[PDB]
Design an enzyme around this catalytic site. Structure first.
Site, PDB file in Angstrom:
ATOM      1  N   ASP A 192       0.657   3.492  -3.371  1.00 19.16           N
ATOM      2  CA  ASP A 192       0.384   5.001  -3.281  1.00 19.16           C
ATOM      3  C   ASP A 192       1.148   5.915  -4.301  1.00 19.16           C
ATOM      4  O   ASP A 192       0.749   6.337  -5.214  1.00 19.16           O
ATOM      5  CB  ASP A 192       0.099   5.460  -1.900  1.00 19.16           C
ATOM      6  CG  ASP A 192      -0.606   6.681  -1.977  1.00 19.16           C
ATOM      7  OD1 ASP A 192      -1.248   7.159  -2.975  1.00 19.16           O
ATOM      8  OD2 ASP A 192      -0.688   7.319  -0.935  1.00 19.16           O
ATOM      9  N   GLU A 218       0.796  -1.210   0.088  1.00 12.40           N
ATOM     10  CA  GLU A 218      -0.011   0.073  -0.061  1.00 12.40           C
ATOM     11  C   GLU A 218       0.824   1.160   0.062  1.00 12.40           C
ATOM     12  O   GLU A 218       0.332   2.403  -0.444  1.00 12.40           O
ATOM     13  CB  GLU A 218      -0.920  -0.034   1.186  1.00 12.40           C
ATOM     14  CG  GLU A 218      -1.802   1.118   1.307  1.00 12.40           C
ATOM     15  CD  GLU A 218      -1.388   2.328   2.084  1.00 12.40           C
ATOM     16  OE1 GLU A 218      -0.271   2.342   2.698  1.00 12.40           O
ATOM     17  OE2 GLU A 218      -2.191   3.325   2.101  1.00 12.40           O
ATOM     18  N   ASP A 261      -7.111   0.833   0.233  1.00 13.57           N
ATOM     19  CA  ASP A 261      -5.657   0.291   0.567  1.00 13.57           C
ATOM     20  C   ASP A 261      -5.119  -0.938  -0.326  1.00 13.57           C
ATOM     21  O   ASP A 261      -4.202  -0.843  -0.756  1.00 13.57           O
ATOM     22  CB  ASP A 261      -5.519   0.038   2.014  1.00 13.57           C
ATOM     23  CG  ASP A 261      -5.233   1.237   2.981  1.00 13.57           C
ATOM     24  OD1 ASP A 261      -6.168   2.210   2.589  1.00 13.57           O
ATOM     25  OD2 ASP A 261      -4.548   1.249   3.782  1.00 13.57           O
ATOM     26  N   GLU A 313      -4.403   0.207  -3.844  1.00 10.69           N
ATOM     27  CA  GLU A 313      -3.156   0.839  -3.810  1.00 10.69           C
ATOM     28  C   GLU A 313      -2.138  -0.483  -3.936  1.00 10.69           C
ATOM     29  O   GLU A 313      -1.236  -0.127  -4.765  1.00 10.69           O
ATOM     30  CB  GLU A 313      -2.749   1.803  -2.739  1.00 10.69           C
ATOM     31  CG  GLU A 313      -3.475   3.170  -2.871  1.00 10.69           C
ATOM     32  CD  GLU A 313      -3.256   3.924  -1.596  1.00 10.69           C
ATOM     33  OE1 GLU A 313      -3.180   3.538  -0.461  1.00 10.69           O
ATOM     34  OE2 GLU A 313      -3.102   5.345  -1.783  1.00 10.69           O
TER      35      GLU A 313
END
Ligand SMILES: Nc1ccn([C@@H]2O[C@H](COP(=O)(O)O)[C@@H](O)[C@H]2O)c(=O)n1
Ligand SMILES: Nc1ccn([C@@H]2O[C@H](COP(=O)(O)O)[C@@H](O)[C@H]2O)c(=O)n1
Ligand SMILES: [Mg+2]
Ligand SMILES: [Mg+2]
Ligand SMILES: [Mg+2]
Ligand SMILES: [Mg+2]
Ligand SMILES: [Mg+2]
Ligand SMILES: [Mg+2]
Lengths: 218, 220
Positions: free
Chosen positions: A42, A38, A105, A108
């Site tokens: 991102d 995650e 999450d 990502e």
RNA sequence: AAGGUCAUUCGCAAGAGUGGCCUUGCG
RNA sequence: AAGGUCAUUCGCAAGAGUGGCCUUGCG
């Protein structure tokens, strides 16, 4: 089970341990979970959005693009890109049942896995991401669906006119605990409005919206 | 232009020199072509470079550990540090105002977006070239603990662990012209209190918090 | 990042840059 | 992202996630 996601994703994972890891909440397996992907995901995805944004925007000014970026990398928008893949059915999770945070999450972490599994090929993972969401992203912008930020819009008009900012004061907090609702007043000069939500910040957002309404006839 | 220098320092030669020029140009110099757009893409691009390096090489991949490292590594101060290698300030084209850490920080992230675009938007190659120059240099800074400490954050978690309270910052003065100021700020927890100075409130607060940290752990 | 604000540079205004301040949103 | 705190969940603790609040840092 993963095979249905890999059809939607259009990508076959060489190492399935990654794809499983990115789909796993820590409440399922403590030692293997999406947490670290995650973090990589991102910065990876936020780069995709910005890269796409600079390419296809008629106006490339930073002041125009940044607030547009603010929505596109938001967790809410990630939840919509997830609906396309129907991620909620693929997650391994036990306690703390799936919500918009958990989904964003995974989404990502999902792409970080593809990045790793492809042997850290950023160029490919970018085009794979583009293949799925490129039209969907350009859709929202061209058709003008972008979450409007009212607290920001409000204070910009108030400072435009009276060189002052609106004041948000709390009224009440009502509910047992996580069912608690907030009621918040928003005042600029002689005008007052109201709004509500599951948080103070959210309740200040709806109140900010109703206030922009309150100055029209004004 | 004189761009032959920077290209050799960068180990990369631009196919489009107009693109390289645009990264070194402030809006003041040219109201038409400047680095504003590349600064935007450059942030997202270079931020990703750093994050990918952290998850990879460091033994501790735990998020709570890695995120504070990212905060310093993607910062303006750290980009100025990496830019000193390239000697960027001598290549910067600017009309009015000194070249400060902000402009260099902007030029740095923008300069890399230029290489990105000129490579035909090859991320693999660009990320490799970024590591080519800075990889060990970055990794050595973490290894040697040259990472900048955050004193406002450290102090707050110190007091909340012990006294279940938060430090309180008071502004005791201001002096100098309005564009160039001087800030003296006091930080307080219990009876322990220290001062600090800076060109901004936060900068002075970081100095005040730092002194408190040293004073505390001594006494405690 | 965005808005207001003081200072300053663009001869003043227009706008723009840089530094300080207040506030808002996204990650 | 980090810390404190309220609630809640893994039988408590430990540690951790989720929702709320205050705060701090970075882009
Ligand atoms: N407070 C901030 C700081 C940065 N940003 C985002 O980060 C980008 C990069 O900012 P920098 O100029 O600081 O590197 C901005 O263009 C904006 O999209 C933001 O949205 N809010
Ligand atoms: N306030 C915040 C929020 C997020 N972040 C960065 O964004 C990353 C991902 O955060 P999200 O869960 O919000 O997407 C964090 O791991 C951290 O690097 C930050 O540095 N400061
Ligand atoms: Mg997280
Ligand atoms: Mg994120
Ligand atoms: Mg800027
Ligand atoms: Mg930046
Ligand atoms: Mg700005
Ligand atoms: Mg956290």
């Amino acid at each position: 089970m993963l095979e249905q996601l890999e059809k939607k994703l259009g990508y076959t994972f060489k190492d399935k341990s990654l794809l499983e890891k990115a789909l796993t909440h820590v409440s399922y397996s403590k030692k293997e979970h999406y947490e670290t992907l995650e973090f990589l995901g991102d910065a990876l995805v936020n780069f995709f959005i910005v890269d796409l944004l600079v390419q296809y925007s008629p106006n490339k000014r930073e002041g125009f693009l940044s607030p547009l970026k603010a929505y596109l990398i938001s967790e809410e928008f990630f939840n919509l890109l997830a609906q396309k893949l129907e991620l909620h059915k693929f997650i391994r999770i036990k306690r703390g049942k799936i919500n918009e945070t958990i989904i964003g999450d995974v989404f990502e972490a999902l792409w970080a896995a593809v990045y790793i599994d492809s042997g850290r090929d950023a160029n490919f993972t970018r085009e794979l991401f583009y293949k799925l969401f490129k039209e969907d992203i350009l859709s929202a912008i061209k058709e003008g669906r972008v979450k409007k930020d009212y607290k920001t819009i409000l204070q910009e008009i108030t400072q435009k006119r009276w060189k002052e900012r609106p004041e948000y004061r709390l009224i009440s907090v009502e509910g047992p605990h996580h069912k608690k609702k907030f009621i918040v007043e928003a005042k600029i000069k002689e005008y007052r409005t109201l709004g509500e939500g599951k948080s103070k910040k959210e309740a200040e957002q709806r109140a900010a919206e109703e206030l922009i309404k309150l100055l029209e006839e004004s």
